[PDB]
């Protein structure tokens, strides 16, 4: 699907049309494969995540097809989180202070990340040993790669405990998934992380170690290790193609730059111009209005995915504040 960049909250005006609001939401997500949906058990909102303002607008429209009288919120720029340096090893202590487990976290290799994003490498717990060929195929050094324990939510959790690690495997995988769901930056989905188990020890037996001991130890170690790697919040970016009469060249270029846009390529065919730009999805809300006035309606424009790129450094503090406050 058009990798999701905007997420909007939609809820039923009558809390009794709820049984069929579920039907409406799953019909809309069936009709449009670019729209992905989930009901927040944490919040009580039904979220619709799509490919931009217009992508979501089509889905908010197709609530008419389902007849659900609803409120639809303004879309939020759905962010992902990553790290910009390697961390030193950080120790997580178990619930009693009974175990110390040490992990180092670093940005995952580009070849591996690409392979995950483009579907060459399937996700999930690395169980079968001889299936380690897959990790090698996706660019990992083989002997090092076979120590992968999970491939989880766009990252890899890997075991260098010799002998050590013998306790925690299942709990560590669950904790890996939970850690990737809500990252260190502002509880946004984590992407492109490698997590290496550096060292480990345990105080109480392995028959007094359960879930309340393993879960906090891994969870606290993981967040702390990510936060000490220069955690970066990223905005989704678009390649933006604008085809406009030459007459509106100056206004159209102005409109692109105003939306954090940078010119990529610029082609001319007779009296028409095609302009290729890159701009954050976050900065292009209401773009139909701005681009229309700035080109006197001459430009027709559309967008393709350019990744979940890093949100700019000087803007990061405010965006983190807004997300956390929400």
């Amino acid at each position: 699907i058009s990798e999701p960049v905007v997420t909007v909250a939609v809820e039923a005006k009558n809390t009794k049309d709820l049984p069929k609001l579920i039907e409406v939401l799953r019909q809309v997500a069936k009709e449009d494969p670019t729209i992905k949906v989930e009901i927040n058990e944490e919040t009580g909102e039904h979220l619709v995540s799509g490919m931009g303002e217009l992508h979501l607008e089509v889905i908010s429209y197709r609530i008419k097809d389902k007849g659900v009288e609803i409120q639809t919120s303004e879309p939020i720029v759905v962010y992902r989180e990553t790290v910009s340096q390697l961390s030193p090893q950080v120790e997580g202590k178990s619930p009693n202070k009974h175990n110390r487990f040490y992990i180092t976290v670093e940005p995952l290799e580009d070849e591996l990340f690409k392979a995950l994003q483009e579907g060459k490498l399937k996700e999930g717990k690395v169980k079968g040993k001889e299936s380690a060929n897959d990790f090698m195929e996706y660019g990992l050094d083989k002997e090092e790669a076979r120590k992968v324990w999970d491939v989880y939510n766009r990252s890899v959790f890997i075991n260098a405990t010799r002998g050590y690690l013998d306790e925690v495997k299942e709990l560590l995988i669950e904790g890996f998934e939970s850690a990737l769901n809500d990252g260190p930056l502002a509880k946004e989905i984590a992407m492109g992380l490698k997590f290496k188990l550096h060292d480990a020890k345990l105080h109480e037996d392995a028959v007094h170690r359960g879930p309340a001991q393993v879960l906090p130890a891994i969870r606290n170690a993981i967040y702390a290790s990510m936060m000490s790697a220069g955690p970066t919040l990223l905005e989704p970016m678009q390649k933006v193609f604008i085809n406009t009469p030459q007459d509106y060249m100056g206004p159209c270029t102005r409109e692109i730059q105003n939306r954090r846009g940078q010119i990529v390529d610029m082609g001319q065919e007779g009296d028409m111009a095609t302009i290729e730009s890159k701009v954050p999805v976050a900065e292009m809300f209401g773009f139909a209005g701005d681009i229309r006035s700035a080109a006197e309606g001459r430009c027709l424009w559309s967008t393709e995915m350019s990744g979940f790129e890093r949100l700019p450094r000087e803007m990061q503090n405010q965006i983190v504040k807004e997300i956390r406050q929400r």
């Binding site: 009794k16 709820l18 058990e41 299942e170 359960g210 879930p211």
Partner: protein, 329 residues
């Protein structure tokens, strides 16, 4: 310091008269504050030794009769009117009635009730004694006020798991006199009626309907998630008043009848930490005090559901008939 009448007087004279030599003291967390003060006074006035129950105590369903069996001669249990349930030990209930005067808030009550002629009054235990004066005021100002009783609750009293006393009153409005959202919240969910609540500490009169709808929409979302669950826990409590093993087993077989796995788990206090071990289980149905599943659900990643909510999951109860579960003896 005393916001509540602990009736030290009565406890001591009955202890002495009965010849008890070791006495257990049970407090809800709101009154554990006073344990040491109380304990020091009893030990100064009787040759009896006091045993303070340190364990949590949510309600009248949660007496430490089993636990203190053989250990003390008498339990003094504070803060509740008793459930009529089987006592392994001599047990004295002290309700600990609030020293609060609602007279000064009755004017603003009247203004907030311009739109209602027929009222149910409701309180919880520590304000039961003030119903009279509220009711008299209201009826002297053109209201019709009804006190509901039932087999389980005194005249005009609710608890989170027994609203039996407002079942068949069919009023325009229910006016709750008390401290927190929970009791007004429960009355709203059972009645789906106008519910007003006077906090005689905040002096604040609040309509609960907004917060209620917020809760309900989260219950919806929990049930939504539970529809995918294939393996289930049925949670049962060793709490005297909260034991509903019959229902637990019935739900077991019903889930199995619906081609799912179900396992009964019994414990005393239910908290997320005790359920972390059962990694296989996708959702849980609470046979203990229903209020855990409703009130604390935000502490649990996995869905915690009342039996009634399970009925909605299995399409055996209508969404329009979402309801709180109750404890009856």
């Amino acid at each position: 310091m005393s916001m509540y009448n602990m009736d030290l007087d009565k406890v001591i004279r009955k202890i002495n008269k009965k010849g008890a030599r070791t006495v257990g003291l049970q407090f809800p967390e709101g009154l554990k504050m006073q344990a040491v003060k109380i304990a020091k006074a009893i030990e100064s006035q009787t040759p009896a030794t006091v045993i303070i129950s340190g364990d949590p105590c949510f309600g009248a369903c949660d007496v430490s009769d089993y636990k203190m069996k053989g250990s003390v001669d008498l339990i003094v249990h504070y803060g509740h009117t008793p459930l009529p349930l089987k006592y392994e030990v001599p047990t004295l209930f002290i309700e600990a009635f609030s020293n609060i005067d609602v007279k000064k808030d009755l004017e603003k009550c009247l203004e907030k009730l311009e739109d209602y002629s027929k009222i149910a009054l409701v309180t919880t235990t520590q304000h039961l004694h003030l119903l009279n004066e509220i009711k008299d005021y209201l009826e002297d100002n053109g209201k019709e006020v009804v006190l509901g009783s039932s087999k389980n609750t005194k005249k005009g009293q609710v608890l989170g798991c027994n609203f039996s006393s407002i079942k068949n009153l069919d009023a325009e409005v229910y006016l709750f006199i008390g401290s927190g959202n929970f009791h007004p919240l429960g009355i709203y969910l059972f009645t789906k009626s106008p519910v007003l609540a006077l906090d005689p500490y905040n002096s604040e009169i609040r309509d609960i309907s907004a917060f209620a709808d917020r809760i309900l929409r989260i219950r919806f979302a929990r049930i939504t998630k539970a529809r995918e669950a294939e393996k289930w826990g049925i949670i049962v409590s060793s709490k005297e008043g909260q034991y509903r093993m019959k229902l637990a087993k019935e739900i077991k077989k019903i889930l199995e009848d619906n081609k799912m796995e179900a396992y009964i788990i019994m414990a005393d206090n239910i908290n997320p930490d005790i359920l972390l071990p059962y990694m296989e289980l996708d959702a849980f149905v609470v046979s203990a005090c229903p209020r855990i599943a409703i009130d604390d659900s935000q502490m649990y990643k996995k869905p915690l559901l009342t039996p009634q909510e399970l009925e909605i999951v299995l399409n055996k109860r209508q969404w329009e008939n979402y309801q709180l579960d109750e404890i009856l003896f």
